[PDB]
């Protein structure tokens, strides 16, 4: 009866998918604002070995 | 129902600006406001005058 | 259980009420039983003195003056029976009184906790439901054309008929529900 | 593990027990019973838990913020430098609040500890809190809800101009 | 912020495409989950706000309000289930969509970084509220109440829009960060005085101010339960948030301009609580109580001191919860007896004890029994006012006394005395209603344990 | 001679309390047990000076273990 | 020292256990009140230990267990002040609560919600302990409001009685008026001394100004039912007698006196506040005793006695003798709670009869209650070497031997006379004489709970005064030498009051009727303070609310000003514009006028 | 007897005697016992003020 | 204190027998004070007061005046106290 | 004046049709599942779990960090004899007075 269950209760996937999409879009926005990733006068450090970004 | 309606709804339709209504409204509406303004303004001005004169004690008044 | 009041209090009734109030306030003042008995017999003699006044105007004026005397001489803190209005225990158990209709909203498990009583209650409900129509008819018939001029309600005229408007008086909550 | 210099405590002088009556002291036996019934099981439980913690010891570190140019040297409408200076000033505000808290804690402890001689034997802590309170009030009070490093600088300048006028 | 916004948007298609039976269930589940997601925002760096992106940011002020909104939506759904049962499926879905749109607009208001976006959405909140009041109200006065609410708010807001555009032209940006960092002081000029009035009056209308509060009693009495819940809990606090944000621009002129509004609020709290003493309608009593508490918040904001702001935030959250619960309690009795007159229903404690307990706790919070967050906020406001002027304590204490009096008077009249004999439709309280009251109460008592969450950024 | 005592229905409110308590405890008891286990065994970290040449992770600035876990996982 | 903190905190935390278990099944069962009583008894037994430690070495401590929140430079933390006052009052309060609950099991047996009653009792006890053991003003305020709310709930225990609801509302009203001054004190201390902890407040405020102390005075007057705020206490007798005996007789009412005592180091500095406390205490003593003299309800008489004793404590504070006031609180708890329990026994025996006029000849009918009440009255009147002697006699001796307002001292002596007088009244009217109760005699005190509960407080009234006075460290320089009449003044005045009261009560037997004197009316009507003060201000406030605030402003004038006038103007303009004429000739002329005007104005 | 038409807004409502509900005889069976009021009876404008739990005007001995 | 119907009757008759003006021998449950006995109105008031003092509950005057019979007093007391046996 | 249906009687109590109504709907199944959804996702999930999550939320407010910095500064300044709190928030030299 799985077809019946999914056919009439698929709406429960929209909102959790919405949360995942929100996380993805927020990470994309974070990508956009990477100008001063490590160029501050406070948290500016030399990249530790095997690191390319401080994710800031 | 009549009591509630008379206490709430019927008041304004059966109101007429009259010298008693107008005078009592003026008094009990704005007079207290001006009285408190006078009291608090005088108090605040006195405090500011004392502060400017350096004649007020706030030795440990560090949390405002 | 209170009787329907009358439009006015007859002069005799007013005199009786004043006598009762005066005796009670005297008892409040005369704490000890012997002194109370002495002054109560004195008061009874005082009433008997003008018991047979023929002039109604004179009797009315005497009533008025006696009421003034009562008000001056009333005890500041008269004795009140504990369950009487103004008494210490007046309406104490009122919150415990619960109307009968609350029963109909019981969950079936609770109603099964006491089956037999609820069978009896169903019998009473049937009785009331059957008697209502006849009660209404009787009230219409006995009511004067202008309308009920007194709060008094007629008794049951015929066998098999319950007193009109009997349900709440009969099923009023117990004085001490607990 | 608190530093004694940061949280001073006067040395403890506890009078020795000098009984003068034959009657047994109930407090002594009650304290021994409390020891045996409560303190020993509690000490054993803490011994066990400390052993478990020592089995897996890991360290957390206290962050260090390098000093940054103040609002005084930050240029106008220079939002980057103003931001750095403002956050630094906010951190300094928090640190000053904590210092005031430490002094107040000393004051309270000294009031309680001295007992009936609080008025005399806590005078030094009272003077310390007096100085700290005056400094904190002068630095931060009256800035308002929207306190900012610029407003504190403005307050400092107003104070210094008043001082020059007093110097005449 | 999209972690909250996008699921909230997706609530609409889910509600529209859900089966007729499952609309309430699905809405409640996912709104509660959205609130659980929103709980993450409470973690705020002390020095700086959480700047998620250019458009959206959060601070220790916005986060409690967002959490309140996200928590409030499922509560509104539970409350509004009962009286909307007879409605057709399309109408119920429309009601739910109005609620969801309101939550979305409120979230975007509290998180917006730009004052013009804040204004756009803060005025956008009117449309769902107006539709709710004027379409699902149960009295003929709903139309008049909606007109009053809409026109008061718009008359306040339009000058705010003009002033915000003028600020954009002068300073160059309406982003709150830039405004805070630059924030040049105002001068005491008639032009600046009127700019101050334009900025302040919209929020002073939203926060019911004495003389501008007439819309609130009509709206709250005439609205359905859910609409009353949002109006009491969040829509008033919209004004408080706006005033706290906007006070940065008007730094010096606030001292001169506060006295009219300060005195109006200080006297109006006493007046409104005295009105509460003599109200004949339970919803009206709660509305005037809200007016008094909001007047306290107005005083705290106008004083512009750290303790005042912390107390203002705490009072906003605590009052939102208390007023929402009180409206729910009144709505239950209204559904049972179909009248809002206080005297009609009496002695309900014997009939409904657990509801009586809920009423007791709600009133105790309303009268600010410690250590309730209500008392924390009120006490902080009182201490700030005392520093502002020692004479304020007289008015503040009088207001506290009258609040206690009217709260316990409502409790005594509704829940004590002999039961009204003729009323026979009182029935055992449903698990939904008790659940709603508990969902109101438990967060409020819990927030006392960790008060730093609702003490605002200045903490 | 027991006389009946009229009282409102109690099945619904008692059931409400039972369901509320059950659903609160359903996660509270696992939560309480987990909190106790973490505090007893994992314990709270010890304050140590930063070793020279080391840049600690952000979660390493927080004492309590659960606080560290939340900081590392969600922030 | 290490056991001290643990024991003291456990004493409070144990009391909470029945509250937590109230969710469990024990609440449903009949075992809940017995569990509550046993919990209180174990708490008392534990509280005895720190009391012994303090007696041995004065091991006072402060415990800041939990840090609630730090507000910038102010730290608020859950702190308990386990000093002499707390460490002594906790055992006394616990012992009294134990006896009261044991009595209540017998007195409240018929009540359906006995479990709710016992739970409310434990809630009040917890709140009072919070009040006593508080090192922050905020924690003390938590206890203050908790005690107030619990009194509100317990007084209106019978929700049916409108009178009970009125009494509860009145108590809330007066106590909130006191809380105004309390909030003033809290705000002043926060703004000036930057702390709510008693320790920092004491440290900084070397010479405390007047305003915070006057606020503390107001809060104390509210809680201790001082004059101007007194009527709530006599009205509180509307509640069940155990509630009266516990809270509104011996424990809750001493909250204000205890608050003043806690702030004694600040109280010493300011002379004016001491004078005001002295005058208020003297007024309370005199007025409440005079009211009690003519009261005919036993509960009212004992309640006015409580108020007079509270006034005596306030006087003692005014004479700047705080520790003596604390001692008097400790003794008053014992003997007054016992007196109220005896009153409750009399009431229950006589089927809910509280009027002394309907009670008579109970000396032999109720031997044990009679012995207990005689002992309690003797202790109350200052019989030597009883509990009252160690407190009240020292109080009077210190009052006489000190710089004092003359009228205050005179009123205190007269009040002691009147205390003897009303003790004579209750004993004479109730136990002595011939029976006046209704025919059916149901007297039966042979209940183990009642007997044992009264037994414990009897033993306390007899010996606790000596025991405590001997054990406590000396805290006041004694008034060693004094004139003989000065020493014996307390006994002389008490005996004079006894003699005059006995003669006047004997005169009642004489078969002579006289109409009431004006002074009798003044005393019986409680000084007319209830009659006018509960009517004129209430009427004026409620009428002002409805007539001005509800109507003349909100529904009339504000509406006329902003909404209605603007709506009317727009309506009139709409009527003008929509003239509904539409004649080409008419509006085309307007075009000509507009063209001409435009040419002129805009060139 | 309607209230005097002075613009207060009472209008048609009658000026019932200012008797507190305490004064009304308790013994009589009232439709609303706690309020001592019968159904259909005109309700005093300030009845809420003159409830038994609030401002009382009952005659005093003095 | 069950206060059964027979107990109420016995106590009412007891009070009436203790009343000097009423002769005990002719006193009966149906003996109307006004007609069968020689009592007047004031005697009715006094006996009502005596009954209300004996049973400790106050009889309202409107109900009090209409008793006129010892059995009426008994059944009225039963109604007030909810005595069904 | 109009042909309108009689006002519906007070909405039928959900107790009548299903005594264990729970409210939330007419059909008992949706009643039970609505109450289960409400109770679980509010009390069990949001209230309990979120209360723990807030309780153990990382101190990003830097309260402990502020205390540690205060301790270090107090120790150093007391050791070196420097005043505990300098009166000037910013160094006087960098400021250029008019």
TrEMBL record, chain B:
It is found in: Mitochondrion inner membrane. Keywords: Electron transport, Membrane, Mitochondrion, Mitochondrion inner membrane, Respiratory chain, Transmembrane, Transmembrane helix, Transport. It comes from the Eukaryota. GO terms for cellular component: mitochondrial inner membrane; nucleoplasm; respiratory chain complex I. Its main location: mitochondrion. The keyword Repeat does not apply. The keyword Transmembrane helix applies. Complex I is composed of 45 different subunits. Belongs to the complex I NDUFB4 subunit family. Accessory subunit of the mitochondrial membrane respiratory chain NADH dehydrogenase (Complex I), that is believed not to be involved in catalysis. Complex I functions in the transfer of electrons from NADH to the respiratory chain. The immediate electron acceptor for the enzyme is believed to be ubiquinone. This is NADH dehydrogenase [ubiquinone] 1 beta subcomplex subunit 4. It comes from Sus scrofa (Pig). The chain holds residues 66 to 129 of 129 of the full protein.
From TrEMBL, chain H:
Complex I is composed of 45 different subunits. It is found in: Mitochondrion inner membrane. This is NADH dehydrogenase [ubiquinone] 1 beta subcomplex subunit 8, mitochondrial. Belongs to the complex I NDUFB8 subunit family. Accessory subunit of the mitochondrial membrane respiratory chain NADH dehydrogenase (Complex I), that is believed not to be involved in catalysis. Complex I functions in the transfer of electrons from NADH to the respiratory chain. The immediate electron acceptor for the enzyme is believed to be ubiquinone. It comes from the Eukaryota.
Automatic annotation (TrEMBL), chain I:
Carrier of the growing fatty acid chain in fatty acid biosynthesis. The chain holds residues 120 to 204 of 204 of the full protein. It comes from Sus scrofa. Residues 6-81 form the Carrier domain. Belongs to the acyl carrier protein (ACP) family. It is found in: Mitochondrion. This is Acyl carrier protein.
Automatic annotation (TrEMBL), chain J:
It is a single-pass membrane protein. Its main location: mitochondrion. It comes from the Eukaryota. Coiled coil: none annotated. Residues 1-22 are annotated as: Disordered. GO terms for cellular component: mitochondrial inner membrane. It is found in: Mitochondrion inner membrane. The chain crosses the membrane at residues 37-58. Keywords: Electron transport, Membrane, Mitochondrion, Mitochondrion inner membrane, Respiratory chain, Signal, Transit peptide, Transmembrane, Transmembrane helix, Transport. Complex I is composed of 45 different subunits. Interacts with BCAP31. Accessory subunit of the mitochondrial membrane respiratory chain NADH dehydrogenase (Complex I), that is believed not to be involved in catalysis. Complex I functions in the transfer of electrons from NADH to the respiratory chain. The immediate electron acceptor for the enzyme is believed to be ubiquinone. Belongs to the complex I NDUFB11 subunit family. This is NADH dehydrogenase [ubiquinone] 1 beta subcomplex subunit 11, mitochondrial. It comes from Sus scrofa.
């Amino acid at each position: 009866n799985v077809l019946q269950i999914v056919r009439d209760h698929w709406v429960h996937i929209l909102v959790p998918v919405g949360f995942v999409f929100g996380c993805y879009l927020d990470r994309r926005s974070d990508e956009k604002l990477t100008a001063f990733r490590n160029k501050s006068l406070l948290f500016k450090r030399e990249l530790r070995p095997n690191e390319e970004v401080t994710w800031k | 129902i009549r009591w509630t309606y008379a206490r709430s709804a019927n008041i304004y339709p059966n109101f007429r600006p009259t010298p008693k209504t107008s005078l009592l409204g003026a008094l009990f509406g704005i007079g207290p406001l001006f009285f408190w303004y006078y009291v608090f303004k005088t108090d605040r001005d006195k405090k500011e005058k004392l502060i400017q004169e350096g004649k007020l004690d706030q030795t440990f008044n560090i949390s405002y | 259980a209170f009787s329907a009041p009358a439009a006015y209090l007859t002069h005799q009734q007013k005199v009786l009420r004043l006598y009762k109030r005066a005796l009670r306030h005297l008892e409040s003042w005369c704490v000890h039983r012997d002194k109370y008995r002495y002054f109560a017999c004195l008061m009874r003699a005082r009433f008997d003195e003008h018991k047979n006044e023929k002039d109604m105007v004179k009797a009315t004026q005497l009533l008025r003056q006696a009421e003034e005397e009562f008000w001056y001489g009333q005890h500041p803190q008269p004795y009140i029976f504990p369950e009487s209005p103004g008494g210490t225990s007046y309406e104490r158990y009122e919150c415990y009184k619960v109307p009968e209709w609350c029963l109909d909203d019981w969950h079936p498990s609770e109603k099964a906790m006491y089956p037999d009583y609820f069978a009896k209650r169903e019998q009473w409900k049937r009785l009331r439901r059957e008697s209502w129509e006849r009660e209404v008819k009787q009230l219409q018939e006995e009511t004067p054309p202008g309308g009920p001029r007194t709060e008094a309600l007629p008794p049951a005229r015929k066998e098999g008929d319950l007193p009109p408007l009997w349900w709440h008086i009969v099923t009023r909550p117990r004085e001490r529900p607990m | 593990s608190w530093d004694k210099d940061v949280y001073p405590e006067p040395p403890r002088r506890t009078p020795a027990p000098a009984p003068q009556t034959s009657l047994p002291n109930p407090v002594t036996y009650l304290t021994k019973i409390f020891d045996l019934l409560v303190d020993r099981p509690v000490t054993l439980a803490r011994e066990f838990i400390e052993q478990q913690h020592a089995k897996n010891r890991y360290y957390y570190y206290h962050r260090e913020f390098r000093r940054v140019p103040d609002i005084t040297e930050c240029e106008e409408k220079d939002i980057l430098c103003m931001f750095e200076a403002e956050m630094q000033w906010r951190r300094d505000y928090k640190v000053d609040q904590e210092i005031v808290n430490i002094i107040q804690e000393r004051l309270k402890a000294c009031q309680q500890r001295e007992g009936e001689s609080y008025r005399q034997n806590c005078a030094k802590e009272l003077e310390q809190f007096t100085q700290v309170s005056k400094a904190f009030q002068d630095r931060y009070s009256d800035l308002g809800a929207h306190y900012s490093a610029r407003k504190c600088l403005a307050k400092q300048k107003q104070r210094m101009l008043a001082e020059r006028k007093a110097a005449k | 912020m999209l972690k909250i916004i996008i699921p909230t948007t997706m609530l609409l298609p889910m509600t529209w495409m859900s089966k007729h039976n499952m609309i309430w269930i699905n809405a409640t589940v996912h709104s509660l989950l959205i609130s659980l997601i929103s709980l993450s925002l409470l973690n705020q760096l002390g020095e700086n706000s959480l700047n998620f992106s250019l458009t959206f940011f959060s601070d220790s002020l916005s986060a409690p309000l967002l959490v309140l909104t996200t928590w409030l939506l499922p509560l509104m759904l539970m409350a509004s289930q009962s009286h909307l049962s007879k409605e057709t499926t399309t109408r119920k879905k429309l009601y739910i969509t109005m609620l969801i749109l309101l939550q979305l607009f409120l979230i975007m208001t509290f998180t917006a970084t730009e004052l013009i976006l804040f204004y756009i959405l803060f005025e956008a909140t009117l449309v769902p509220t107006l539709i709710i009041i004027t379409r699902w109200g149960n009295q003929t006065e709903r139309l008049n109440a909606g007109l009053y609410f809409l026109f008061y708010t718009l008359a306040g807001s339009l000058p705010l829009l003009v002033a915000l555009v003028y600020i954009q032209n002068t300073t160059g940006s309406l982003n709150f960060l830039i405004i805070h960092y630059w924030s040049h002081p105002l001068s005491n000029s008639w032009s600046n005085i009127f700019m101050w009035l334009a900025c302040i009056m919209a929020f002073m209308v939203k926060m019911p101010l004495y003389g501008l509060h007439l819309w609130l009693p009509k709206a709250h009495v005439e609205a359905p339960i859910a609409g009353s819940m949002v109006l009491a809990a969040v829509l008033l606090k919209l004004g408080g948030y706006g005033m706290m944000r906007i006070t940065t621009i008007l730094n010096p002129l606030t001292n001169y301009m506060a006295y009219p509004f300060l005195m109006l609020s200080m006297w109006g709290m006493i007046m409104t609580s005295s009105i509460c003493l003599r109200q004949t309608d339970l919803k009206s009593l709660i509305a005037y109580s809200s007016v008094s508490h909001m007047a306290l918040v107005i005083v705290a904001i106008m004083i512009q001191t750290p303790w005042s702001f912390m107390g203002a935030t705490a009072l906003m959250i605590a009052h939102g919860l208390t007023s929402s619960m009180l409206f729910c309690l009144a709505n239950t009795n209204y559904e049972r007896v179909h009248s809002r007159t206080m005297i009609l229903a009496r002695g309900l404690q014997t009939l409904l004890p657990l509801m009586a307990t809920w009423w007791l706790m709600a009133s105790l919070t309303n009268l600010a029994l410690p250590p309730s967050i209500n008392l924390i906020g009120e006490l902080f406001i009182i201490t700030a006012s005392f520093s502002w002027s020692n004479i304020t304590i007289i008015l503040m204490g009088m207001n506290m006394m009258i609040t206690a009096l009217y709260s316990l008077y409502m409790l005594i009249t509704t829940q004590r005395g002999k039961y009204t004999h003729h009323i026979n439709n009182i029935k055992a309280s449903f698990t939904r209603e008790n659940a709603l009251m508990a969902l109101h109460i438990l967060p409020l008592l819990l927030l006392t344990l960790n008060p730093k969450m609702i003490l605002g950024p200045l903490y | 001679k027991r006389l009946f005592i009229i009282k409102p229905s109690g099945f619904y409110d008692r059931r409400f309390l039972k369901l509320m308590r059950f659903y609160i405890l359903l996660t509270g008891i696992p939560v309480a047990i987990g909190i106790t286990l973490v505090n007893v065994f994992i314990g709270e970290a010890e304050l140590a000076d930063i070793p020279e040449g080391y840049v600690p992770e952000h979660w390493e600035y927080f004492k309590h273990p659960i606080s560290r876990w939340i900081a590392r996982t969600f922030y | 020292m290490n056991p001290f903190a643990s024991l003291t905190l456990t004493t409070l935390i144990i009391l909470t256990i029945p509250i937590m278990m109230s969710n469990s099944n024990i609440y449903k069962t009949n075992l809940y009140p017995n569990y509550v009583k046993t919990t209180v008894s174990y708490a008392f037994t534990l509280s005895l230990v720190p009391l012994l430690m303090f007696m041995h070495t004065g091991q006072e401590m402060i415990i800041s267990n939990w840090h609630w929140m730090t507000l910038q430079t102010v730290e608020l933390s859950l702190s308990f002040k386990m000093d002499y006052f707390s460490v002594m009052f906790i055992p006394v309060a616990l012992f009294v609560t134990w006896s009261i609950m044991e009595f209540s099991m017998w007195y409240m047996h018929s009540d359906p919600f006995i479990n709710r009653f016992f739970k409310y009792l434990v809630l009040f006890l917890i709140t009072m302990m919070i009040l006593v053991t508080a090192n922050n003003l905020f924690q003390l305020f938590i206890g203050w409001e908790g005690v107030g709310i619990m009194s509100f709930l317990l007084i209106g225990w019978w929700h049916g009685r409108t009178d009970a609801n009125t009494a509860a509302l009145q108590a809330i009203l007066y106590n909130r008026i006191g809380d105004i001054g309390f909030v003033l004190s809290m705000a002043w201390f926060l703004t000036h001394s930057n702390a709510w902890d008693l320790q920092q407040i004491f440290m900084l405020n070397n010479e405390c100004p007047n305003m915070p102390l006057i606020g503390l005075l107001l809060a104390a007057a509210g809680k201790s039912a001082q004059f101007g705020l007194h009527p709530w206490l006599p009205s509180a007798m509307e509640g069940p007698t155990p509630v009266s005996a516990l809270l509104h007789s011996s424990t809750m009412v001493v909250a204000g006196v205890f608050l003043l005592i806690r702030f004694y180091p600040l109280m010493e500095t300011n002379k004016l506040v001491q004078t005001m406390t002295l005058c208020l205490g003297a007024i309370t003593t005199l007025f409440t005793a005079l009211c009690a003299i003519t009261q005919n309800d036993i509960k009212k008489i004992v309640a006015f006695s409580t108020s007079s004793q509270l006034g005596l404590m306030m006087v003692t504070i005014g004479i700047n003798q705080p520790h003596l006031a604390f001692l008097h609180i400790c003794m008053h708890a014992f003997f007054k709670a016992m007196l109220f329990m005896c009153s409750g026994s009399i009431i229950h025996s006589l089927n809910d009869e509280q009027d002394i006029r309907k009670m008579g000849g109970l000396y032999k009918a109720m031997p044990f209650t009679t012995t207990a009440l005689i002992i309690g009255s003797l202790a109350l009147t200052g019989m030597p070497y009883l509990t009252g002697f160690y407190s009240k006699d020292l109080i009077i001796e210190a009052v006489n031997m000190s710089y004092t307002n003359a009228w205050a001292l005179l009123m205190t002596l007269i009040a002691t006379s009147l205390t003897a007088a009303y003790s004579t009244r209750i004993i004479f009217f109730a136990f002595l004489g011939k029976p006046r109760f209704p025919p059916l005699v149901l007297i039966n005190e042979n209940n183990p709970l009642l007997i044992n509960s009264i037994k414990r407080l009897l033993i306390g009234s007899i010996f606790a005064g000596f025991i405590i006075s001997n054990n406590i460290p000396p805290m006041t320089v004694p008034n060693t030498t004094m004139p003989l009449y000065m020493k014996m003044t307390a006994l002389i005045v008490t005996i004079m009051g006894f003699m005059l009261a006995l003669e006047l009560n004997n005169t009642t037997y004489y078969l002579k009727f006289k109409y009431p004197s004006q002074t009798y009316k003044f005393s019986n009507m409680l000084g007319y303070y209830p009659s006018i003060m509960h009517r004129l201000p209430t009427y004026h406030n409620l009428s002002m609310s409805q007539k001005s605030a509800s109507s003349l402003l909100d529904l009339i004038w504000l509406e006329t000003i902003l909404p209605k006038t603007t709506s009317f103007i727009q309506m009139k303009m709409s009527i003008m514009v929509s003239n509904q004429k539409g004649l080409i000739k008419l509006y085309f002329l307007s075009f000509l006028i507009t063209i001409m005007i435009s040419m002129t104005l805009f060139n | 007897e309607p209230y005097p038409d002075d613009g207060m807004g009472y209008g048609d409502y009658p000026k019932l005697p200012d008797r507190s509900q305490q004064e009304r005889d308790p013994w009589y069976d009232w439709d609303h016992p706690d309020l001592r009021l019968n159904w259909g009876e005109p309700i005093h404008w300030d009845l809420d003020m003159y409830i038994r739990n609030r401002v009382d005007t009952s005659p005093t001995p003095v | 204190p069950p206060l059964t119907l027979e107990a109420i009757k016995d106590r009412v008759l007891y009070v009436l027998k203790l009343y000097d003006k009423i002769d005990p021998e002719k006193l009966s449950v149906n003996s109307h004070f006004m007609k069968d006995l020689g009592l007047d109105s004031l005697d009715q008031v006094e006996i009502i007061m005596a009954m209300e003092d004996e049973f400790g509950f106050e009889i309202p005057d409107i109900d009090a005046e209409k008793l006129m019979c010892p059995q009426e007093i008994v059944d009225y007391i039963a109604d007030k106290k909810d005595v069904y046996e | 004046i109009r042909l309108q249906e009689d006002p519906d009687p007070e909405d039928e109590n959900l107790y009548e049709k299903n005594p264990d109504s729970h409210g939330y709907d007419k059909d008992p199944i949706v009643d039970l599942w609505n109450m289960r959804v409400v109770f679980f996702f509010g009390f069990s999930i949001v209230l309990v779990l979120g209360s723990t999550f807030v309780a153990y939320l990382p101190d990003y407010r830097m309260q402990e960090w502020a205390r540690r910095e205060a301790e270090r500064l107090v120790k150093y300044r007391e050791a070196n004899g420097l005043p505990l709190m300098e009166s000037n928030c910013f160094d006087p030299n960098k400021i250029q007075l008019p």
